[PDB]
Amino acid sequence: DANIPFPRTSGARFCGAGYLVYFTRPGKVIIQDIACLLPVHKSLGELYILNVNDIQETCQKNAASALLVGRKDLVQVWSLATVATDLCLGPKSDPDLETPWARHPFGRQLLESLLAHYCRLRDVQTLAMLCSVFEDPRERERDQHDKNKRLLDPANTQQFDDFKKCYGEILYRWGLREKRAEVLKFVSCPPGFTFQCAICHVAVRGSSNFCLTCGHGGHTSHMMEWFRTQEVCPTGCGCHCLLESTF
Amino acid sequence: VINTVDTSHEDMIHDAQMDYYGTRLATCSSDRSVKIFDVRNGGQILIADLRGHEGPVWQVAWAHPMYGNILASCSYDRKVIIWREENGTWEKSHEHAGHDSSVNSVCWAPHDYGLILACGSSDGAISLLTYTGEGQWEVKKINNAHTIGCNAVSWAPAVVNYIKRFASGGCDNLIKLWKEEEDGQWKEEQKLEAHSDWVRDVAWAPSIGLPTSTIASCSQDGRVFIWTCDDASSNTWSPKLLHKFNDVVWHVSWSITANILAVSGGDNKVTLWKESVDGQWVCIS
Amino acid sequence: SRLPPDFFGVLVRDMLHFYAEQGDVQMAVSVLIVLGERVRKDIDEQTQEHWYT
Ligand SMILES: [Zn+2]
Ligand SMILES: [Zn+2]
Ligand SMILES: [Zn+2]
């Protein structure tokens, strides 16, 4: 074995989200916590409520969490986001009427400044949350007005989507999936016979289950109630569905 | 806190990698054995055993949970063994010996592409084993990939279809960067050569949206090079030194967000770097 | 563990300048008076006289 860089006996490595491993020669594998080193925290992650309907409630609820955790620049930035996202500043379709809030210096420019600072600080968490929350004839003017209409530049949608993908991957790392769905809800780009019930016979249109073998199905809560106590097909088929439907 | 598990091994330990959720711990060693330890609330208990590979083990890499529980092992024996497990027991699944020299490194590909496994063996070649399905794999080959043989391999973060790119470097200190054309050929693109003798490890930083691709390196002569580049599609790779220790550097690692680099080499020690506002890398511990 | 102190000064200055350009010299002077020394050391002295007059 000519190519022999053999005597390997030490190594360090990052693993998980908040973890580190290393071993040495005198030899048990010692790991360590680095949660306070990275700019992201799981504790703050579990609390960050998000919503598409009531934006203000999300901002003011996230505001208290950072104070409950210890961070400060967020208990400022979230307040600024709250005051800079009210429906009173709603844009108007006509370009004549009033200057849009985007062109106000405290509008787009503030967003770019915050994004740049937190890009330097390398904190994908706050980037993801801020971006998610803030998300011949005279004809050739309304298009430009709609371009200037938005608080986020239409020419950098890709980076925002990348931020929102990366935070989802880290959330999957941590062990929370519902939050991974809430965050990803904002991303722009996309990701015979026999139709009756079997326990109440009313036509089903939404969520349902069935056996692969039996071929008898119905409403999901119906099956919860039915299989809470028994092990037979509800329609006199004889299948022990706990041995057929599941793997 | 500090968590410690007793290895109960009889010979050396070469690598140790955990799982995606932080709920497993794998251990390679030269006893021709792998001992999987379940780490949870500070307790060392066994789950499986690897009693036979026909030789010592070098490097193991866990795969993405999306595809199940898959573990790979590249080692001294000239074989790469997978450990797909079923029904609560770990079992040998599939092996191939597409090399005539000890396998050096293995690194699991990004999950978007599929379930791909790059194998940089010591005989100047790289094999990319793709999962065809139904318990069948495809083994590609690129002969004469190195004049001294690639020491270690790494995968590039996926960007926006798709363009597969990965980086590797051998014992001729001529680290290169590959690519794949529409046909399926692994065409070469460039070759960085600002290295002294050999390059043991190569690691590529995770991508978090910043328009900048960062590659780490570690030469057999003490040097930790950070080959940053931010020229979009101009392809300008400008090396920048970080230090020069008193002995050979072995392994370079990254964080999730690419803010801390941990390099542990021949000095039987581990030092943690960073990237200051000015642009100099300093120690912390 | 906080934002850098001199972070928002540029935005304040730009907001004032933007308000002066449209012709709303009423809000610029009011902000200047209310703030005082926290902003008085960033605007040219020949412009303040223009606004005030
Ligand atoms: Zn029903
Ligand atoms: Zn039935
Ligand atoms: Zn059934």
Curated annotation (Swiss-Prot), chain A:
Residue numbers spanned by region Disordered: 136-153
Q: Where is the composition biased (Basic and acidic residues)?
A: 136-152
In residue terms, where are the WD repeats? Answer: 50-88
Query: Which compartments does it reside in?
Result: Lysosome membrane
Chain positions recorded as Zn(2+) 4 binding sites: 216, 233, 237
Cystine pairs: none
Query: Is DNA-binding a UniProt keyword of this protein?
Result: no
Q: Which residues bind Zn(2+) 3?
A: 211, 239, 241
**What GO terms are given for molecular function?**
signaling adaptor activity; zinc ion binding
Residues recorded as binding Zn(2+) 2, renumbered to this chain, are 200, 219, 222
**RING-type ZnF:** 194-246
Major site of localization recorded for this protein: membrane
Q: Name one GO cellular component term.
A: Seh1-associated complex
GO BP field: cellular response to amino acid starvation; cellular response to nutrient levels; negative regulation of TORC1 signaling; positive regulation of TORC1 signaling
Q: Which UniProt keywords apply?
A: Lysosome, Membrane, Metal-binding, Phosphoprotein, Repeat, WD repeat, Zinc, Zinc-finger
Q: What assembly does the database describe for this protein?
A: Component of the GATOR2 subcomplex, composed of MIOS, SEC13, SEH1L, WDR24 and WDR59. The GATOR2 complex interacts with CASTOR1 and CASTOR2; the interaction is negatively regulated by arginine. The GATOR2 complex interacts with SESN1, SESN2 and SESN3; the interaction is negatively regulated by amino acids. Interacts with DDB1-CUL4A/B E3 ligase complexes.
Q: What does this protein do?
A: As a component of the GATOR2 complex, functions as an activator of the amino acid-sensing branch of the mTORC1 signaling pathway. The GATOR2 complex indirectly activates mTORC1 through the inhibition of the GATOR1 subcomplex. GATOR2 probably acts as an E3 ubiquitin-protein ligase toward GATOR1. In the presence of abundant amino acids, the GATOR2 complex mediates ubiquitination of the NPRL2 core component of the GATOR1 complex, leading to GATOR1 inactivation. In the absence of amino acids, GATOR2 is inhibited, activating the GATOR1 complex.
Family indicated by similarity: Belongs to the WD repeat WDR59 family.
Quote the protein name from its UniProt record: GATOR2 complex protein WDR59
| Organism taxonomic ancestry | Eukaryota, Metazoa, Chordata, Craniata, Vertebrata
Q: Which gene encodes it?
A: WDR59
Curated annotation (Swiss-Prot), chain B:
As for what it does, the entry says: Functions as a component of the nuclear pore complex (NPC) and the COPII coat. At the endoplasmic reticulum, SEC13 is involved in the biogenesis of COPII-coated vesicles. Required for the exit of adipsin (CFD/ADN), an adipocyte-secreted protein from the endoplasmic reticulum. As a component of the GATOR2 complex, functions as an activator of the amino acid-sensing branch of the mTORC1 signaling pathway. The GATOR2 complex indirectly activates mTORC1 through the inhibition of the GATOR1 subcomplex. GATOR2 probably acts as an E3 ubiquitin-protein ligase toward GATOR1. In the presence of abundant amino acids, the GATOR2 complex mediates ubiquitination of the NPRL2 core component of the GATOR1 complex, leading to GATOR1 inactivation. In the absence of amino acids, GATOR2 is inhibited, activating the GATOR1 complex.
Q: Tell me the name of the encoding gene.
A: SEC13
In terms of Pfam families, this protein maps to:
WD40
State the SMART domains in the record.
WD40 (SM00320)
Q: Please give, as recorded in its UniProt entry, the membrane topology of this protein.
A: Peripheral membrane protein
**UniProt name for this protein:** Protein SEC13 homolog
UniProt record similarity statement = Belongs to the WD repeat SEC13 family.
For this UniProt record, give its keywords in alphabetical order, as a comma-separated list: Acetylation, Cytoplasmic vesicle, Endoplasmic reticulum, ER-Golgi transport, Lysosome, Membrane, mRNA transport, Nuclear pore complex, Nucleus, Phosphoprotein, Protein transport, Repeat, Translocation, Transport, WD repeat
Q: How does it assemble?
A: At the nuclear pore: component of the Y-shaped Nup107-160 subcomplex of the nuclear pore complex (NPC). The Nup107-160 subcomplex includes NUP160, NUP133, NUP107, NUP98, NUP85, NUP43, NUP37, SEH1 and SEC13. At the COPII coat complex: interacts with SEC31A and SEC31B. Interacts with SEC16A. Interacts with SEC16B. Component of the GATOR2 subcomplex, composed of MIOS, SEC13, SEH1L, WDR24 and WDR59. The GATOR2 complex interacts with CASTOR1 and CASTOR2; the interaction is negatively regulated by arginine.
UniProtKB/Swiss-Prot annotation, chain C:
Q: Which domain of life is it from?
A: Eukaryota
Q: How is it modified after translation?
A: Autoubiquitinated; MIOS is required to prevent autoubiquitination.
Q: Where in the cell is it found?
A: Lysosome membrane
Q: Note the subunit structure.
A: Component of the GATOR2 subcomplex, composed of MIOS, SEC13, SEH1L, WDR24 and WDR59. The GATOR2 complex interacts with CASTOR1 and CASTOR2; the interaction is negatively regulated by arginine. The GATOR2 complex interacts with SESN1, SESN2 and SESN3; the interaction is negatively regulated by amino acids. SESN1, SESN2 and SESN3 convey leucine availability via direct interaction with SEH1L and WDR24.
Q: Which family does it belong to?
A: Belongs to the WD repeat WDR24 family.
Its biological function? Catalytic component of the GATOR2 complex, a multiprotein complex that acts as an activator of the amino acid-sensing branch of the mTORC1 signaling pathway. The GATOR2 complex indirectly activates mTORC1 through the inhibition of the GATOR1 subcomplex. GATOR2 probably acts as an E3 ubiquitin-protein ligase toward GATOR1. In the presence of abundant amino acids, the GATOR2 complex mediates ubiquitination of the NPRL2 core component of the GATOR1 complex, leading to GATOR1 inactivation. In the absence of amino acids, GATOR2 is inhibited, activating the GATOR1 complex.
Q: By what name is this protein known?
A: GATOR2 complex protein WDR24
State the species of origin: Homo sapiens (Human)
Upper lineage: Eukaryota, Metazoa, Chordata, Craniata, Vertebrata
Write the gene name. Answer: WDR24
